Amino acid sequence: KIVNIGAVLSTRKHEQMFREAVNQANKRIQLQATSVTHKPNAIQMALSVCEDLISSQVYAILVSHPPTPNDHFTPTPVSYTAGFYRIPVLGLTTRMSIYSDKSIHLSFLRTVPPYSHQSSVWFEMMRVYNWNHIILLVSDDHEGRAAQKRLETLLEERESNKRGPKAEKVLQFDPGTKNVTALLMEARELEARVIILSASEDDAATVYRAAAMLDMTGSGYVWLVGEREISGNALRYAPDGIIGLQLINGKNESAHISDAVGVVAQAVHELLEKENITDPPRGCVGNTNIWKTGPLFKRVLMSSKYADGVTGRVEFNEDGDRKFAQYSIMNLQNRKLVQVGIYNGTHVIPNDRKIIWPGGETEKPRGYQMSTRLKIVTIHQEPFVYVKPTMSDGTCKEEFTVNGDPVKKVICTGPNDTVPQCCYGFCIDLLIKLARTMQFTYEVHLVADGKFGTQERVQNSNKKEWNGMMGELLSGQADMIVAPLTINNERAQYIEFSKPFKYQGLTILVKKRITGINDPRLRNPSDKFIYATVKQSSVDIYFRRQVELSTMYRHMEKHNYESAAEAIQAVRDNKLHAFIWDSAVLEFEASQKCDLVTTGELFFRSGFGIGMRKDSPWKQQVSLSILKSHENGFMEDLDKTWVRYQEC
Amino acid sequence: PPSIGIAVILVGTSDEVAIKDAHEKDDFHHLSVVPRVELVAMNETDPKSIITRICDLMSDRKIQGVVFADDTDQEAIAQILDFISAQTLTPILGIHGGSSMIMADKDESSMFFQFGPSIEQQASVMLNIMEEYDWYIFSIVTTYFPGYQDFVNKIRSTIENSFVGWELEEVLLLDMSLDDGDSKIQNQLKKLQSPIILLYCTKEEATYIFEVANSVGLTGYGYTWIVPSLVAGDTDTVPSEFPTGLISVSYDEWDYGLPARVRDGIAIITTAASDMLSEHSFIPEPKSSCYNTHEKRIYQSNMLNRYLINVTFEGRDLSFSEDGYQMHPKLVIILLNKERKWERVGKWKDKSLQMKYYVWPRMCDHLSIVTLEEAPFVIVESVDPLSGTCMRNTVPCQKR
Amino acid sequence: DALLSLKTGKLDAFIYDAAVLNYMAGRDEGCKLVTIGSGKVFASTGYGIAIQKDSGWKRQVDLAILQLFGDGEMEELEALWLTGICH
């Protein structure tokens, strides 16, 4: 009818006052406490648990008895043994979720809640900051990686108005490295100033050090770091205007361990408040199995809550680790902490004085900033872009129009089979309409693939994804590129593309029957009838979705030409019946050279395109921009500029 | 040729005599040392006794290490397999029971070894079974219990980049601790149009929502049941609250013997050990006792354990994973029989499987048909050689 | 075997099902082989895939036929599989 609990404390006062409050709340059907020290050897704490707790039939122990040299205090295998009896255990020794995970440690709690909600409190706290674009990286590790995971769960929480919990970029680092200078270059590649990371204080010293070297730690980058990164020796390397945080009243075993006594009492009377309330067997040796009621007692721990404790009102968590904590924010004042205050679940405490941003920034700056030059890549589209070899100095030959206007070819760089060049085409003219709307420069590259990209499963990994520069747009390699291509569900599957005002067409061109594809002459092409399209083309997907594609796609896969330019070759060569290509582009080619007679059929008529990946100002800018494009004569211009360029 | 000081644990009911025979009945020619025999003995299941006779055993005796195993249910088998492994800096590979069980997310420096697939890789072979099940669309289930984001993770992952005709409806993850606000058993229950039912949860909770599903009856004949071996637990255990005729896979209880494959495993310890005997040509400084090993911790830096982490023995691959999972994992397909007990489904190993029978796991509508190909009326078809899938409606036929 | 035979004419003619003569009819490398006559009915009959004797699907499968004729996709595949090269 009395509680018997062995334990292991950090200091004598921990054990004595432990038994003291144990008496006090034991009155608040009686209970007492017994504790040990932190046993130096691993086996010392081990058999120590096998006796002082076990032989005591120990109720529970809230255990932090570190040197406070971090270390994620060893007694994980201890609470394990508590599982060997299914006896209760609650971690006092860690602010990491390492002490959380049940598959590792089932019975456990946190007087220092897992750092998960911490940076999440920095997430909703960024909603307070009202920041949007935010990028993140950290060193390779389970707690770190999965920490970023849970952060994404916070981001994933917003899944179900204007903008939102914008995730800028997710990077990662390895554990224990010196130079992030590559990832620093990624931060350069990061437009957003929001810097989300977590580490220890010394790796954080690498962060502010090499970051300042990259001028990342320089003013103009909003650094949200981890407490372990923030607190500690990093104070020497502390970034200017940076802030750091920790939960309210966490590090003091006085109020925190006192709270362990109080909630321990809520679970004592509560421990006496359930059916078949008792204590587990004592002897470790002599216990070969887990206590069934001891496990049921842990269910009571899942049922364990407290009205108000020594730290005040606190409940359990999903992990049962504390609850409703408050992380005290401290702004920098002359490289010294000026406390903003504690952000509870609902509550958040700003400072009295204005907090210091990393620089002299009064408010959170605007992170996302697009580049003036937006790199582009494509293959010459005879419909618009004709890329000629430039001058010996790379200059382009000044070329008047039929009207006489000295049209401007599009300077470019392209591969060896690397070389710069220029391109005469109406596409870059539409680009001049683009920068003409909102100024955007660009860097032109080439595209050697079978399309923009072709969703494709490679010879390895069987990974089906766009094969071509389209992945590089998914990769954003070229910042903003374009191709006069029709969109596909694959693009839909890939990313939102633009809507070109151009109206394209898709059919096969023949040299100059010849009915539609379904026509038996075409549907059953004879030996004399050979036809194909470019390998890995978009039409390759088109026919690649069809009932009869066996003959067409399959049988033509033999006849399939890799290069569409090569299809023009064998086409004018008339080495085959007809050539499947873009019927629009066919009209462009039939325009310049009528030696091929294109069909008159109508299939897959969409239009041109430009590089569009997820959120871009080109969303509405480019959308309504096109609305003007067709809405203005620039459309009719291209007609004149291109369609009217057809003599025959 | 150096004799490897070792201890092979025996606890509970176990016959280690034949183990002593075979371990003394073989000689390893390729390895530096020929095959050897050292066998630990234990009785009590108290982990305190595990530290006693074990931490006293390998340390007190002459050993550079030991391989401990038993058939018990111990999770602390893993908890102190890694905890005591790295705590001793000693590799721990469970050869049976709660020992051979795959540790979930061990410690960084944890020396405890392992063999098998990933639960990820497990459910992946299960996806291969779905190809055998030939269900293009699918769906799954999970609890909030662990492996949740993992099973869904590698699940949608395998369902992601592939060129396979894999498709799935969804998976309902939840927590049955409190009540169900929506009684979502029905809500997600009707949401399931796929016959295959694949859930992730504990066998007891599996009985909670499984029996709750019998109440829903959504298990009604024509569905299909994919179960985790962990969710399954004991083959001898056959809770009726779970779905009848459920399917699973795991390490072979029938085909794979503990003493035999365990002995071969010791021979693998010889394989990687001799590999390091050549390559490393040295070893870290061993200190037997805990306080002794307390000072010798820093003296342990193993890239040969890494070299050991990549290994093969007796033609089998001894290379473990970051989970310790066997680089070439082998497993036995499992099922729940008409016995109201489990059924042996087959054996699946490393992108290969031995199915129960040519016909699907026929239940107890479906009607057999057979004919000859006369085209255009009837055409035989060659399924995708790399895969076996096809476009359109093409279906297979019988070949003796 | 007998098809390429008749192609060479290894026998005077190749007898076969008017269906065999149908799939054989449309598809031909060159134009040589022709039907018995133009293809006039020889032993008018029709084929289907039955089931177990007095199967319950009897009236049901009958309705399935009612969907066959009541389909017109019979014309569809009547091209798809059954469109001939001869035409």
Task: Please spell the DSSP secondary structure of A592-608, one letter per residue.
Answer: H-TTEEE----------
Measured between alpha carbons, how far is A56 from A54 in angstroms, rounded to an integer? 5
H or E stretch covering A454: strand A454-457
* Strands A62-63 vs A90-91: parallel, antiparallel or unpaired: parallel
By the CB < 8 Å criterion, does C83 face chain A? yes
How far apart are the two ends of chain C, measured CA to CA in Å? 24
Measured CA to CA in angstroms, residue A140 lies from A197, A208, A339, A636, B258 at distances of 12, 18, 31, 56, 36
* Residue C40 CB partners (closer than 8 Å, separation 6+): none
Say which residues have a Cβ less than 8 Å from residue B78's Cβ, sequence separation at least 6: B94, B98, B99, B101, B103, B104, B106, B112
Task: Give the length of chain A.
Answer: 648
- Taking CB atoms and an 8 Å limit, are C83 and A548 in contact across chains? no
Q: What three-state secondary structure class fits A172?
A: coil
Pairing of strands B330-336, B247-250: antiparallel
Q: Which residues of A132-141 are buried (b: 16+ CB within 10 A; e: fewer)?
A: bbbbbbbbeb
d(CA B215, CA B168): 25
Residues in chain C: 87
Distance (Å, whole) CA A367 – CA A184? 16
Cβ atoms of B71 and B95 closer than 8 Å: no
* H-run or E-run covering A149: helix A142-157
Experimental method: cryo-EM
Residue B210: CB partners within 8 Å, gap ≥ 6?
B199, B219, B239, B241, B242, B243
Residues of C in contact with B371 (CB under 8 A): 49
Q: Does the distance separating the beta carbons of C20 and B374 come in below 8 Å? A: yes
Give contacts of A524 with chain C, Cβ < 8 Å.
83, 85
Q: Using CA atoms, how far apart are residues B281 and B274, in angstroms rounded to an integer?
A: 9
Amino acid code (one letter) for A412: C
Q: Do C85 and A524 touch (CB under 8 A)?
A: yes
Nearest to B310 by CA among B332, B293, B289, B327: B327
CB contact under 8 A, A80 and B49: no
Query: How far is Cα A14 from Cα A605, in angstroms, rounded to an integer?
Result: 79
Long-range contacts at B389-398 (CB < 8 A, ≥ 24 apart): B389/B164, B389/B165, B391/A549, B392/A547, B397/B370, B398/B358, B398/B370
Q: Which amino acid is at A46?
A: A
Q: Rounded to the nearest 5 degrees, what angle is found at the Cα of A330, between the Cα atoms of A327 and A335?
A: 150
Q: Which of B337, B346, B325, B318 is nearest to B254 (CA)?
A: B346
Find out whether A505 and A603 touch, Cβ atoms under 8 Å: yes
Estimate the crossing angle of helix A633-641 against helix A618-631, to 10 degrees: 70
User: With contact defined as beta carbons under 8 Å apart, do C26 and C78 qualify?
Assistant: no
CA pair distance A108, A91, nearest whole angstrom: 5
Which positions in chain B touch A461 (Cβ < 8 Å)?
161
Give the separation between CA B83 and CA A604, rounded to whole angstroms: 63
Query: Could you tell me if B374 lies within 8 Å of chain C, comparing CB atoms?
Result: yes
Contacts of B173 in chain A (CB under 8 A): none
Quick check: C60 contacting A, CB < 8 Å? no
The verdict on B377 touching C (C-beta cutoff 8 Å) is yes
Pair A464, A457: CB distance under 8 Å: yes
- How open is the CA angle A551-A557-A559, to the nearest 5 degrees? 95
| Number of C-beta neighbours around residue B177 at 10 A | 13
Most B CBs within 10 Å: which of A47, A73, A96, A103, as the mutation test of the B interface? A103
CA distance A106 to A38: 22
Whether the Cβ atoms of residue A375 and residue A443 lie closer than 8 Å to each other: yes
Q: Are A487 and A497 in contact (CB under 8 A)?
A: yes
**Gap between the Cα atoms of A611 and A609, Å rounded:** 7
Cα atoms in the Cβ-side hemisphere of radius 13 Å centred on A333: 11
- What are the distances in angstroms from CA A574 to CA A179, A215, A568, A595? 59, 61, 9, 10
Query: Cα dihedral angle (A166, A169, A175, A176), rounded to 10 degrees?
Result: -110
Please report where in the chains the tokens 């920034």 appear, as a residue. A361
B350: left (phi over 0), alpha (psi -120 to 50) or beta: left
C-alpha span between A220 and A238 (Å, rounded): 16
Spatial distance between the Cα atoms of A216 and A137, rounded to a whole number of angstroms: 14
- List the one residue out of A67, A48, A66 whose CA is nearest residue A56: A48
Sequence-ordered list of residues with C-beta below 8 angstroms from that of B308, at least 6 positions apart, any chain: B91, B272, B273, B275, B276, B302
Please check whether residue A102 is in contact with residue B146, taking contact to mean a CB–CB distance below 8 angstroms: yes
The alpha carbon dihedral of A53, A54, A59, A64 has a sign of positive
Phi, psi of A382 (to 5 degrees): -55, -35
Check CB contact under 8 Å for A80 and B55: no
Chains touching chain C through at least 3 C-beta pairs below 8 angstroms are A, B
Q: C-alpha distances in angstroms, B11 versus B46, B50, B113, B350? A: 11, 10, 20, 31
Backbone angles phi, psi at B294, to 5 degrees: -60, -40
The rounded Cα B40 to chain-centroid distance in angstroms is 25
**What is the rounded CA–CA span in Å between residue A73 and residue A616?**
48
Task: Encode A66-92: b = buried (16+ Cβ within 10 Å), e = exposed.
Answer: beeeeebbbbbbbbbbbbbbbbbbbbb
Max Cα–Cα distance, chain C, nearest Å: 49
Establish whether the linkage from the previous residue to B376 is cis, with ω within 30° of 0.
yes
| Cβ A527 vs Cβ A507: under 8 Å | no
Distance of CA A185 to the CA centre of its chain: 18
Amino acid at residue number A44: Q
Q: What is the DSSP letter of A145?
A: H
Per-residue buried b or exposed e for A579-615, using 16+ beta carbons within 10 Å of the residue's own CB: bbbbbbbbbbbbbeeeebebbebebbebbbbbbbbee
Cα distance between residue C59 and residue C51, in whole Å: 12
Token pair 């539609």 in the structure block, residue: A516
Query: How far, in Å, CA of A283 to CA of A286, rounded?
Result: 5
A5, A58 in Cβ contact below 8 A?
Answer: yes
CA B352/CA B154 separation, integer angstroms: 19
Contact A231, A244 (CB under 8 A): yes
Distance CA A349, CA A245 (A): 12
Other CB atoms closer than 10 Å to residue B279's CB: what's the count?
Answer: 13
The whole-angstrom separation of Cα A227 and Cα A114 is 11
In Å, what is the CA distance from B277 to each residue of A335, A465, A499? 54, 45, 66
Among the partner-chain residues A50, A104, A288, the one whose CB lies closest to the CB of B45 is: A288
3-state secondary structure (DSSP) of residue C34: coil
The resolution in Å comes to 6.8
**CA-CA-CA-CA dihedral for A413, A417, A423, A426, to nearest 10:** -110
d(Cα B145, Cα B200) in Å, to the nearest integer?
8
Probe site for chain C from A524, A548, A551 (most C CB atoms < 10 A):
A524
Strands A441-446 and A373-378 come out as parallel
Chain breaks in chain A (C to N over 2.5 A) after: 28, 160, 417, 512
- Sole residue written with tokens 């959308």: A623
Inter-axis angle of helices B119-133 and B148-158, nearest 10: 50
Q: Are A172 and A138 contacting, i.e. CB atoms less than 8 angstroms apart?
A: yes
HSE of B290 in the Cβ direction (CA atoms, 13 Å)? 19
Q: Which residue has the tokens 């010196």?
A: A178
- Beta strand A222-224 with A167-170 is unpaired
Cβ pair B252, B347 in contact under 8 A: yes
| Pairing mode of beta strands B330-336, B347-349 | antiparallel
**Which residues in chain A have their CB less than 8 angstroms from residue C85's CB?**
520, 524
Helix or strand (DSSP H, E) at A441: strand A441-446
Q: Both tokens of residue C25?
A: 């009819």
**Nearest-angstrom CA–CA distance, B204 and C83:** 60
How far, in whole angstroms, is CA B382 from its chain's centroid? Answer: 34
Quote the CA–CA distance of B218 and B190 in Å, as a whole number.
7
How far C32 CA sits from the closest chain A CA (Å)? 16
Report chain C residues whose CB lies below 8 A from the CB of B365. none
Residues of B in contact with C86 (CB under 8 A): none
What Rg value do the Cα atoms of chain A yield, rounded? 34
The candidate with the shortest Cα–Cα distance to A327, out of A227, A235, A438, is: A227
For chain A, say whether C87 makes contact (Cβ under 8 Å): yes
- Nearest residue on chain C to B367, alpha-carbon basis: C51
Nearest-neighbour CA in chain C from B368: distance (Å):
10
Q: Whole-angstrom distance between the N-terminal and C-terminal Cα of chain A?
A: 106
Which tokens is B160 given? 């992601």
Helix (H) / strand (E) containing A121: helix A115-129
Q: How many other CB atoms sit within 10 Å of the CB of residue C22?
A: 18
Q: Do B75 and A83 touch (CB under 8 A)?
A: yes
CA atoms within 13 A on the CB side of B153: 11
Name the H helices within chain B.
Answer: 17-25, 47-49, 57-60, 76-87, 97-100, 119-133, 148-158, 184-190, 203-216, 229-232, 258-279, 290-296, 304-309
Q: Where are the beta strands (DSSP E) in chain B?
A: 140-143, 171-174, 196-198, 224-226, 247-250, 312-313, 316-317, 330-336, 342-344, 347-349, 353-354
Other beta carbons within 10 Å of A569: 13
> CA nearest A10: which of A62, A50, A58?
A62
Nearest one of B48, B56, B108 to B74, comparing CA atoms: B48
B335 pairs with which residues across the strands? B247, B343
